[PDB]
Structure 1
Amino acid sequence: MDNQSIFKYSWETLPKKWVKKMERSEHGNRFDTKTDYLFQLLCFLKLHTYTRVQVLIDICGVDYPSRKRRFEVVYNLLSTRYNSRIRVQTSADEVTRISSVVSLFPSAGWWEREVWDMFGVSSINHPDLRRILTDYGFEGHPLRKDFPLSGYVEVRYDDPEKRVVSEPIEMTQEFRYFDFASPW
């Protein structure tokens, strides 16, 4: 009920070679594409003089630890001129160098670094610099469904032996997990 116009026009004029799925819901319109043409598709937008997006709002990762293509990268981006927003959602596995968009939207270096360390998805061109959010040399990638909530090695305390140290976790009052589920 919001932006059927831009979405319809974008789908009916696109080179239909690189679109794998389209969903015109009312929660948000989705162009699920192939990871090989992502840069091509995004550079089509931001330039075409009707569906010009010109602003990238978010690049978030989603983890599904039950599918062969484990990860799911998602680009939420709006069109300040045409009052519309679309969500281009690509698939991505373990190591598979995904194209960058820092050439088009310079506001992706930080969001691509965040998806580099939180998740483990790579990025072939520039934005895959070192980690950002997590502190320093960090074992895993602490937002997939495997890195436990309390971390592998997280005890970090002072030592008058020398100065300060990081040692494996021996926390007290273990994390209780309640069930609450409901078989109808």
Structure 2
Amino acid sequence: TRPTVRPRNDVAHKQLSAFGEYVAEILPKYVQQVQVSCFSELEICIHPDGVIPVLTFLRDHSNAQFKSLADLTAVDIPTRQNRFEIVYNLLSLRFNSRIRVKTYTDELTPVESSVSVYKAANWYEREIWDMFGVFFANHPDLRRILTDYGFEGHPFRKDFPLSGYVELRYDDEVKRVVAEPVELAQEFRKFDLNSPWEAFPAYRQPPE
């Protein structure tokens, strides 16, 4: 398995497992799961009441010093009753490491804003408001950032269609760009691509 297979990094796996145990036992009030991927990425899956205490820990603790917020992300997964999965990618420049801090919310429960921990989040979770509808409590200026000004709907929710519900055109009667319900001259062609055969037996879920 030398030439075409990715080489496995066992040292980083052991070190991130040790630090995941470390964070899970320093903060048992909020840490729900700790996992390390096969390509050596640590994920701390927490309760959403511990957004500020965990992120303040990793930013300020002398064994963590995750001073940089690389990226802040939501994921819509509609089969969960807490469908939105808020993802904090963090970078420690002191220990040259990356961690992932994951939590959850539904449409109505607010997540506490992490602008007091990382100012970088000021736009990111603002975008999570615009793209997913996750409200962030105590954000300084929470509003839309990417959509049009009269835009109804949170587009990166997976029940939002690819083309939207409206489309613009100029109308010369009213001398104005107007919004109408979207009619495509060619419909987007949905391709059902998934093979009916199991691809990865290591990921087989136990049946009902």
TM-score normalised over the length of structure 2: 0.82
In the other structure, the counterpart of 1:29 is 42
CA offset at residue 11 of structure 1? Answer: 3.1
State the identity %.
50
1:45-124 equivalences in 2 (<5 Å): 45-124=58-137
d(CA) in 1 for partners of 2:172, 2:136: 42
Q: Is 1:157 equivalent to 2:169 in the alignment?
A: yes
| Cα distance in 2, alignment partners of residues 7 and 101 from structure 1 | 26
Considering Cα pairs closer than 8 Å and 6+ residues apart, tell me whether 1 or 2 has the greater RCO: 1
**1:128 and 1:7 mapped to 2: Cα distance?**
38
How far residue 3 of structure 1 moved from its aligned partner, in angstroms, is 6.4
Question: Are 2:26 and 1:14 equivalent residues in the alignment?
Answer: yes
The whole-number CA distance in structure 1 between the counterparts of 2:65 and 2:54 is 12
Q: Deviations over 1:142-174 (max 9, x none)?
A: 0111110010012x1112212121111112011
Give me the TM-score of the superposition, normalised by structure 1.
0.92
**Runs of 4+ deviating beyond 6 Å:** none
**Number of residue equivalences:** 183
How far does the alpha carbon of each residue in 1:85-129 deviate from its partner, in whole angstroms, 9 at most, with x for none?
000000111111111111111111110111001001110012561
Aligned-pair Cα RMSD in Å: 1.6
Structure 1 gap ranges (5+): none
Q: Distance in 1 between matches of 2:95 and 2:63?
A: 8
- Deviates most, 3-12 or 133-142: 3-12
Deviation at 1:4, TM superposition (A): 4.3
Aligned residues of 1:97 and 1:124 also touching (Cα < 8 A): yes
Q: Whole-Å Cα distance in 1 between the matches of residues 58 and 193 of structure 2?
A: 45
Partner-residue secondary structure (3-state), 2:71? strand
2-structure distance, mates of 1:44, 1:182: 44
Residue 9 of structure 1: CA displacement?
Answer: 3.5
